[PDB]
Design goal:
Bound molecules: chlorophyll A, the ligand CC1=CCCC(C)(C)[C@H]1/C=C/C(C)=C/C=C/C(C)=C/C=C/C=C(C)/C=C/C=C(C)/C=C/C1=C(C)CCCC1(C)C, dodecyl-alpha-D-maltoside, phylloquinone, iron/sulfur cluster
Number of strands of chain H: 4
Oligomer: part of a larger assembly
Distance between the termini of chain E: 20 Å
Helix content of chain E: over 70%
Helix content of chain H: 10-25%
Structural class of chain E: mainly alpha
Order of helices and strands of chain E: HHHHH
Strand order of the largest sheet of chain H: 1-4
Number of strands of chain E: 0
Strand content of chain H: 15-25%
Chains: A mainly alpha (161), B mainly alpha (30), C mainly alpha (42), D mainly alpha (33), E mainly alpha (107), F mainly beta (60), G alpha+beta (138), H alpha+beta (80), I mainly alpha (732)
Shape of chain H: elongated
Number of helices of chain E: 5
Strand content of chain E: under 5%
Largest sheet of chain H: 2 strands, antiparallel
Order of helices and strands of chain H: EHEEHE
Number of helices of chain H: 2
């Protein structure tokens, strides 16, 4: 398919990996009596291995000649869920964290002792801020366009050139 | 192969280069 | 509840430990109920 | 090896006499007023 | 010592992956990592890190997110102490994982 | 500038260059740097006040 | 003027005292007066007892003498100490306090050495003074 | 020897003179600051270069500056 | 004491610091007592002559030691079976079994087996006997003597050049581009056509017959006739046996592409046309600047005129002409950067497209050559940034560079350093996270959960060059593309045959391990650049030290005040970046050697499966390939690898010794030396003996440098012993 890789649900080396993992757990299972808690734990591990390999084989993942899933991250929509959509989820959460931290820093600057606000958090105000972060791209962009995000170069300290 | 005389000729050329190198080192040392 | 004890509970190391444990517990329970998520299913 | 005497002549000289004379003369040079 | 003790007896900790002793292989790698990480504190000095922190403070100042508690590089004594602590942790953890994996496998 | 005003620093070597301090006292005698400015951020040596000339100081 | 006959504090001796460079290059002397016999710490390591009256002591470095002076100033309230430099030829050079007044107090007749008439940020660039005997201060 | 300079940003607080272990600095009369005094370095041949004077200086960037130069027996702090 | 005669301050030092600092500042001519610009330039000119003579003497020594003690005439007959000899061994510390074990190469005396590849190079360029090797060694001795005499002569009065001659940019650029680059390349093309190709075709050409043995049967008549394509007709057959006339062609200038099927190296006719074309292009480049005849370009006018009118670059390149001409450190930084890029290019392109016959089958030689030139590249790039920092300290005049590109670099240095810091932290966080993720998930028995990103961008580039492995079907891997049809008559068959045969290192197949190791390389390059750029741009001053330019490029610290100022100088940034340079060349050479060792073994899947996690690197590359190296000597015997087995341990020792100078600092050692001084002065029968210089501890900067030197030497010797002994044990 892409880059000469084959889908994992028809790659024989993917099946060989699954068979080897199941056999490695089953030879451990052989030394325990049926009904013992180690036997149930090992059978649950076998079930989880089988379910994981089935799910990976039915997901459209591509496997190389090693027998393991290979991710495609060039932007194509047939593999957008391998990097692009996890990337969007991360970017949402990270922009949330950055926005609420910046908002708390700017609030703490207004306090009587800002450093005390840094080491002893005002928990209700911080919880208000972490609630505000769900609309962080629009809020941050409006903060940017109103001149409230970027400060001019003549108001930042710099070393002698 | 290489003879004794050829090695001696190379040694003489290397000695000439040694004298020239000593002169350059003295010139650079002012 | 004593306000001084609440103020101690609001200190940076305590809140840091509680928040990171809370986050870790989210990741652990998500991976317990939805394991082996190498990809976003689409 | 042609001129096989040359390693046994030159290797002790280059490895023991040359550094000894260089170290002695460099010592005299760097310590003299 | 290098071949018959270090090279020979480390075979158990580096082939522990996929077994019950794989935690020792992970701790082996992590302790090599922490030991190497210690050399950044041990070999360097405070002024470099303070000037790099000055540039990072400029970056946070550009977005008006500079903290009220001014970030400083670690003190010279703290640089030595942090480097020594991560060095001791890394080396002792490496020997810990190596010993435990080897002796559990062969003894 | 006067006592109590908020001023920006134009001394290049200063820790508080292009930062804002508050004027605490302007000396009237013939002092080379008569403007005492107090800053909310401490320097690397831990001080938070410094003397500047008039041309190193701009009112904001 | 250093009186060589001033008695010394009673000290049992140590390996931290002055080496051959004291008798070959230069040596330092510190004198002071105490109101009583009392134990002080030697700057070279060890405890000595200074006598009541005058005390003369010999050291290898000026910094050792000034460390002893600071110790007897801050622990015994002794401020009359004098520090001299002695050469192998016998020349004694009075060092501290240089004009009789301590350097942290302004004294008349002192002239400023090393004073620069501008701020430190007004120094010249090294490229300005390269291949040229101009100082970087201007 | 090391070179010690005193710039006219000095406020005459005498802290560098009190911090000097080698008696290099002293206070002289001046009119440029409110204290009426400025530091000076007449005895830089005794300067070891410890920069305790720079540590003592309270003016934003220092008024007293030590530039390490040619090393002598005194400047190296050698008791031998 | 008058050893440092160039420094009065150093000569009056009463301690052992005087000797060390006189040794360490001897070639820093700009800082010497009473140095003028004219004397500085003349001394530099003579020193450059001396370095040229050193290079020629070293090459003549290689040639002579091979012609005398090597087996070149035996190796020419059987190039793929005979081990090439570098030089003989005469070590009186050997025992008899070491004499037996080093007696290799078909000779009767102990020898070292050459790894430099000089055999393949000299055989490819037409040398066949020991006699012409000896003649080349004599010629290079004579050339070295000539350059020594020239260095002496151009310092004599009425031959010392003036500063106007030294700062003549246009004449030196024209002569060095047209003559030193162009005519040298044209003359090398002449040597290949006239000598190397006939000796490759079994015909002897020497000084005794080269005026009567035509390189081509038609002579220079097709060249003077304009029928140049006659020189491309009848190339070497794919049945050609190198160094013989069997299957030989008559062509001298081709564009065949690919490799000779027997030598597995580039066609010599392709190399001859390449160097001819390079010579023509460079001679055309060398007529560009105006020297004496009105025509030509002025460098100052070109620099001043290229200011973009939108004003984004400020004043543009105005003042850069004087800033570059007046600063030898600017020139040195530019030269070292360009050289470092090109020796990296040499390392990549020479393994990928070898030019010397039978050297692609010499695995030890390929590994040594790649590792050598890549470490040289790292050193050169670090030097470029270091001497750029020295330019900012010593030679940068801000008033002469108002609103310049240099001034605007200095004006947005904080943005530059902060974005470098961000990209380094970005790369390191996620690259280390993917590696640790793969390590943990493979250790827990589930390698199928690994994050394995296919490097599709570089695979797409390979397919654009014609690699049909990935099925991308674009550019040269598409049989209907205009790029395919454009080159189909000239070089496309040979290139496509070479790129799609898995018997060479031409565009080797890549997978997720390759992806991860290139992103680790990107991390290491960006981080070393961060340290070096931050050192260069903060060299003049920072918030912690706004007057740093008053203290020079190198100084220990500014004391414990202001929080503490350890390692604040730009020299210290060089010192910190040296470790990162060693780390990045280590990663690059580790990747190259492991990939090539697994490919040569026929076990490339071992690299493909083990390189995605760090334990695979530690176990399948370091631990697995250490076995013949650490068994060079053992309690049962010894063999020829024992020297590397020694050197390996040697490296592991001296590297560790470097740690002592980088962890323990001065005051401890000074107090120990004070106790030792007391002990010597108080010991009878030894206080009769007195030192002339007072013993002191090493200075702060000196100790940083000495620890760096021991560390770097241990790094280099350890890896060199490992790579040579491991490749020799597995394959040789
Ligand atoms: C309020 C949080 C906050 C925000 C918005 C930023 C913003 C920024 N930082 Mg910064 N930073 C922070 C905290 C923050 N920082 C802290 C606490 C540290 C110390 C570890 C650093 C250390 C740091 C370095 C060393 C670098 C940056 C860089 C950057 C820039 C690029 C983004 C980046 O690399 O992120 C990456 C950030 C980190 C790896 C550290 C973040 C640590 C935590 C996760 C964030 C703090 C969350 C906080 C607890 C929230 C509390 C709010 C609550 C009370 C309501 C950007 C200006 C880079 C730069 O200059 O780029 C131009 C750079 O090189 N920062
Ligand atoms: C920046 C590096 C990086 C990245 C991108 C990832 C990404 C991922 N890891 Mg990994 N990991 C990392 C570093 C990293 N990790 C490190 C440093 C370690 C060692 C401490 C691990 C140890 C680790 C384990 C042991 C496991 C993961 C798992 C996962 C997956 C998360 C599934 C999930 O939570 O569903 C979110 C589900 C929701 C419903 C929300 C995802 C592919 C898990 C997985 O599924 O593997 C495929 C898993 O079992 N990782
Ligand atoms: C390239 C330099 C070089 C050379 C040529 C040699 C040569 C030799 N070493 Mg060696 N060595 C060297 C470097 C070198 N070493 C270094 C760097 C070290 C430090 C690691 C050592 C440490 C070492 C040890 C510890 C020993 C040797 C020994 C030997 C001898 C081999 C055994 C034998 O048959 O001795 C038979 C010896 C003799 C017949 C006596 C020869 C006496 C000579 C000719 C007198 C020369 C006097 C002097 C150099 C005059 C010049 C002074 C002037 C420079 C100021 C041989 C002479 C062994 C030995 O026997 O030592 C004598 C021995 O025990 N070496
Ligand atoms: C045509 C006339 C000519 C020629 C040939 C040269 C040649 C040279 N000049 Mg020059 N020069 C000239 C005119 C000329 N000059 C004029 C007119 C002036 C006055 C304006 C000067 C002023 C001048 C100065 C002031 C200096 C020189 C220097 C040099 C030397 C540079 C170092 C060196 O060997 O690089 C050799 C470089 C090459 C052969 C090519 C460059 C290498 C690149 C990277 C390509 C190589 C790649 C290739 C694959 C390698 C294959 C080999 C491999 C297989 C082993 C070189 C010998 C310097 C020197 O050393 O003086 C002694 C020096 O300081 N020149
Ligand atoms: C980026 C590459 C570059 C650029 C932009 C330039 C640019 C320039 N070079 Mg340069 N040069 C270069 C590379 C470059 N060079 C290289 C690589 C080399 C050497 C190997 C040289 C060597 C070189 C020399 C030696 C000289 C230049 C000169 C010049 C300038 C002359 C401009 C010109 O030709 O006007 C000429 C104007 C025209 C051609 C206009 C055409 C006139 C009419 C309209 C003709 C058309 C009529 C009709 C429509 C067509 C039909 C005709 C039919 C009836 C017959 C110009 C600034 C010269 C100069 O002035 O130096 C500063 C000079 O002497 N160059
Ligand atoms: C052709 C390349 C080249 C040239 C001409 C120079 C030349 C110079 N360098 Mg440079 N340098 C280079 C490559 C080069 N270097 C590389 C590759 C590196 C990285 C390892 C450096 C790292 C470097 C540093 C860090 C420093 C120099 C310094 C110097 C100067 C004095 C050298 C000295 O005293 O050592 C004498 C050594 C010996 C006599 C031992 C033999 C001199 C101008 C020093 C200097 O004074 O600059 C301010 C300095 O601090 N360079
Ligand atoms: C293995 C050793 C190691 C490691 C990991 C680092 C890591 C780093 N160095 Mg570094 N360094 C080292 C050795 C090392 N160094 C040595 C030996 C030297 C020579 C003295 C240097 C010299 C040096 C300089 C001069 C510079 C760096 C910089 C950097 C940073 C950017 C590069 C990067 O990957 O960012 C990503 C960061 C990392 C990979 C660090 C690891 C982060 C961990 C894994 C996060 C998890 C933390 C964990 C949860 C904490 C739990 C602890 C708790 C349980 C107690 C980073 C912090 C540069 C910098 O600051 O750039 C901004 C810089 O300027 N270093
Ligand atoms: C700044 C970070 C950074 C850096 C320095 C590199 C550096 C490199 N990459 Mg890499 N890469 C990165 C990020 C980065 N990458 C990311 C985020 C991805 C997606 C997972 C990839 C995917 C990737 C592939 C598939 C390949 C490379 C390759 C390479 C090498 C060749 C150059 C190239 O293809 O550029 C590629 C880099 C870019 C096109 C952009 C990087 C810079 C941007 C700012 C990264 C930010 C992306 C952003 C966070 C995501 C947007 C949101 C999205 C979820 C919608 C080189 C070592 C090739 C290789 O291994 O050759 C041997 C190769 O085939 N890279
Ligand atoms: C700090 C210091 C202070 C002042 C002095 C100083 C020395 C100047 C400075 C240091 C500066 C430092 C030393 C700078 C060091 C710098 C680095 C090493 C320069 C590398 C440049 C790479 C170039 C742009 C070639 C890129 C290839 C591109 C064009 C190709 C495209 C295409 C080609 C044609 C062909 C096909 C491939 C594709 C991709 C299609
Ligand atoms: C005036 C306007 C047009 C000018 C065109 C000039 C073209 C270039 C002239 C080439 C140099 C002179 O060329 C003249 O002497 C050469 C001497 O080797 C001859 O060359 C001849 O001898 C060579 C050396 O043995 C052989 O390799 C040639 O095959 C043979 O042709 C040319 O046949 C002749 O034409
Ligand atoms: C890297 C390094 C630093 C930089 C180290 C920084 C200043 C300290 C970093 C401490 C962090 C902020 C605390 C814990 C980090 C966690 C991994 C993540 C951050 C958590 C935040 C909420 C604070 C020095 O200050 C230093 C000083 C002297 C010698 C060597 C060095 C040295 O090598
Ligand atoms: S560096 Fe030390 S000895 Fe020198 S003047 Fe300053 S405090 Fe005195």
């Amino acid at each position: 398919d892409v880059a000469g890789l084959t889908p994992c649900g028809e790659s024989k080396e993917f099946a060989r990996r699954l068979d080897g993992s199941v056999k490695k757990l089953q030879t451990r299972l052989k030394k325990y009596e049926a009904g013992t808690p180690p036997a149930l734990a090992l059978q649950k591990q076998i079930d989880k291995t089988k379910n994981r390999f089935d799910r990976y084989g039915k997901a459209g993942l591509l496997c190389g000649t090693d027998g393991l899933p290979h991710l495609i991250a060039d932007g194509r929509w047939s593999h957008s869920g391998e990097f692009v959509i996890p990337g969007l989820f991360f970017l949402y959460v990270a922009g949330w964290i950055g926005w609420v931290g910046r908002s708390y820093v700017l609030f703490a600057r207004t306090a009587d002792k800002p450093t005390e606000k840094e080491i002893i958090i005002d928990v209700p105000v911080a919880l208000s801020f972490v609630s505000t972060g769900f609309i962080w791209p629009f809020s941050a962009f409006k903060e940017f366009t109103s001149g409230n995000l970027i400060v001019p170069a003549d108001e930042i300290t710099v070393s002698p050139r | 192969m290489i003879s004794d005389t050829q090695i001696f000729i190379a040694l003489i050329l290397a000695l000439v280069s040694l004298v020239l190198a000593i002169r350059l080192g003295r010139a650079l040392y002012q | 509840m004593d306000s001084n004890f609440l103020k101690y509970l609001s200190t940076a190391p305590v809140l840091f430990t509680v928040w990171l444990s809370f986050t870790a517990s989210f990741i652990i329970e998500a991976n317990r109920f939805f394991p082996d998520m190498l990809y976003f299913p689409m | 090896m042609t001129a096989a005497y040359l390693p046994s002549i030159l290797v002790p000289i280059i490895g023991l006499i040359f550094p000894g004379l260089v170290m002695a003369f460099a010592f005299i040079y760097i310590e003299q007023d | 010592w290098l071949r018959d003790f270090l090279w020979a007896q480390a075979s158990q900790v580096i082939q522990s992956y996929g077994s019950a002793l794989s935690a020792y292989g992970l701790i082996f790698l992590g302790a090599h990592f922490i030991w190497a990480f210690s050399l950044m504190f041990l070999f360097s000095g405070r002024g470099y890190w303070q000037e790099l922190i000055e540039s990072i403070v400029w970056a946070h100042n550009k977005l008006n997110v500079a903290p009220a508690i001014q970030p400083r590089a670690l003190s010279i004594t703290q640089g030595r102490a942090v480097g020594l602590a991560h060095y001791l942790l890394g080396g002792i953890g490496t020997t810990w994982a190596f010993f435990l994996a080897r002796i559990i496998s062969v003894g | 500038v006067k006592r109590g005003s908020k001023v920006r620093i134009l001394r290049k070597e200063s820790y508080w260059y292009q930062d804002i301090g508050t004027v605490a006292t302007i000396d009237t005698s013939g002092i080379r740097y008569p403007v005492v400015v107090r800053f909310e951020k401490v320097s690397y040596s831990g001080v938070n006040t410094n003397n500047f000339s008039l041309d190193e100081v701009v009112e904001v | 003027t250093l009186n060589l006959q001033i008695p010394s504090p009673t000290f049992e001796g140590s390996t931290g005292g002055w080496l051959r460079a004291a008798e070959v290059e230069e040596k330092y002397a510190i004198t002071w007066t105490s109101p009583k016999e009392q134990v002080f710490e030697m700057p070279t390591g060890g405890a000595a007892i200074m006598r009541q009256g005058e005390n003369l002591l010999y050291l290898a470095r000026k910094e050792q003498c000034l460390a002893l002076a600071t110790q007897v100033k801050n622990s015994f309230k002794i401020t009359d100490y004098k520090v001299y430099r002695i050469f192998p030829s016998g020349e004694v050079q009075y060092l501290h306090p240089k004009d009789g007044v301590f350097p942290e107090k302004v004294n008349a007749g002192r002239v400023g050495v090393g004073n620069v008439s501008h701020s430190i940020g007004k120094n010249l660039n090294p490229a300005q003074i390269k291949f040229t005997s101009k100082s970087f201060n201007g | 020897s090391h070179s010690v300079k005193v710039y006219d940003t000095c406020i005459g607080c005498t802290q560098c003179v009190r911090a000097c272990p080698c008696d290099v600095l002293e206070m002289v009369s001046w009119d440029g600051c409110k204290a009426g005094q400025i530091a000076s370095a007449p005895r830089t041949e005794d300067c070891i270069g410890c920069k305790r004077c720079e540590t003592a200086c309270p003016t934003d960037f220092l008024s007293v500056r030590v530039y390490l130069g040619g090393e002598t027996t005194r400047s190296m702090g050698l008791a031998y | 004491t008058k050893f440092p005669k160039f420094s009065q301050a150093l000569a009056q030092d009463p301690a052992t610091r005087r000797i060390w600092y006189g040794l360490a500042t001897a070639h820093d001519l700009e800082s010497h007592d009473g140095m003028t610009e004219e004397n500085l330039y003349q001394k530099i000119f003579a020193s450059h002559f001396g370095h040229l003579a050193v290079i020629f003497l070293w090459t003549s020594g290689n040639l002579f030691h091979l012609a005398w003690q090597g087996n070149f005439e035996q190796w020419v007959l059987n190039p793929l079976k005979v081990k090439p000899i570098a030089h003989a061994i005469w070590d009186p510390h050997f025992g008899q079994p070491a004499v037996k074990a080093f007696t290799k190469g078909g000779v009767s005396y102990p020898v070292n087996i050459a790894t430099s590849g000089v055999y393949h190079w000299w055989y490819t360029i037409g040398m066949r006997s020991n006699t012409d090797l000896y003649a080349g060694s004599l010629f290079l001795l004579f050339l070295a003597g000539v350059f020594l005499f020239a260095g002496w002569l151009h310092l004599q009065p009425k031959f010392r050049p003036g500063l106007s001659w030294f700062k003549n940019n246009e004449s030196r650029l024209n002569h060095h581009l047209s003559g030193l680059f162009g005519f040298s390349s044209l003359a090398w093309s002449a040597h290949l056509i006239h000598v190397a190709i006939p000796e490759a075709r079994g015909q002897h050409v020497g000084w005794d017959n080269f005026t009567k043995v035509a390189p081509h049967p038609a002579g220079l008549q097709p060249f003077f006739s304009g029928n140049w394509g006659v020189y491309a007709a009848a190339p070497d057959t794919t049945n050609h046996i190198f160094g013989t006339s069997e299957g030989a062609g008559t062509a001298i200038l081709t564009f065949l592409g690919g490799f000779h099927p027997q030598t597995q190296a580039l066609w010599l006719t392709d190399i001859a046309h390449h160097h001819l074309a390079i010579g023509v292009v460079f001679i055309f480049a060398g007529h560009m600047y105006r020297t004496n005849w009105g025509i030509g370009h002025s460098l100052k006018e070109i620099l001043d005129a290229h200011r973009p009118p939108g004003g984004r670059l400020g004043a543009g390149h105005k003042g850069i002409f004087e800033t570059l001409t007046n600063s030898l450190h600017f020139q040195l930084g530019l030269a070292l950067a360009s050289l470092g890029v090109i020796t990296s290019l040499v390392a990549q392109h020479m393994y990928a497209l070898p030019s010397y016959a039978f050297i692609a089958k010499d695995y030890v030689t390929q590994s040594a050559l790649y590792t050598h030139h890549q470490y040289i590249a790292g050193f050169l790039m670090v030097g470029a940034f270091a001497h750029g920092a020295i330019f900012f300290v010593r030679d940068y005049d801000p008033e002469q560079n108002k609103n310049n590109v240099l001034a605007r670099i200095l004006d947005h240095k904080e943005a530059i350093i902060s974005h470098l810091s961000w990209v380094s932290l970005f790369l390191g966080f996620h690259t280390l996270g993917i590696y640790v993720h793969n390590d943990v998930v493979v250790a827990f028995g589930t390698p199928e959960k690994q994050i394995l990103v296919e490097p599709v961008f570089a695979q797409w580039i390979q397919a654009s060059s014609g690699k049909a492995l990935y099925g991308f079907d674009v550019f040269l891997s598409s049989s209907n593309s205009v790029a395919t049809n454009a080159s189909s008559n000239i070089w496309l068959p040979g290139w496509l045959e070479a790129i799609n045969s898995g018997k060479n290192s031409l565009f080797l197949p890549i997978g997720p391990g390759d992806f991860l190791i290139h992103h680790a390389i990107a991390l290491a390059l960006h981080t070393t650049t961060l340290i070096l750029v931050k050192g260069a741009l903060d060299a003049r001053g920072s918030k912690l030290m706004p007057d740093k330019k008053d203290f020079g490029y190198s100084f220990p610290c500014d004391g414990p005040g202001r929080g503490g100022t350890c390692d604040i100088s730009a020299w210290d940034a060089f010192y910190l970046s040296m470790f990162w340079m060693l780390n990045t060349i280590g990663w690059v050479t580790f990747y190259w050697h492991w990939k090539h060792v697994t490919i040569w073994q026929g076990n490339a899947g071992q690299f493909n499966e083990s390189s995605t996690y760090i334990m695979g690197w530690l176990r399948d590359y370091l631990w697995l390939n250490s076995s013949p190296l650490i068994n060079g000597y053992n309690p049962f015997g010894m063999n020829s690898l024992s020297v590397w087995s020694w050197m390996f341990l040697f490296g592991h020792l001296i590297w560790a010794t470097g740690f002592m100078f980088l962890i323990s600092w001065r005051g401890y050692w000074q107090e120990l030396i004070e106790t030792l001084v007391w002990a010597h002065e108080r010991t009878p029968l030894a206080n009769l003996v007195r030192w002339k210089d007072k013993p002191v501890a090493l200075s702060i900067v000196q100790a940083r440098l000495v620890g760096l030197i021991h560390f770097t030497a241990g790094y280099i010797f350890t890896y060199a012993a490992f790579v040579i002994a491991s490749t020799t044990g597995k394959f040789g």
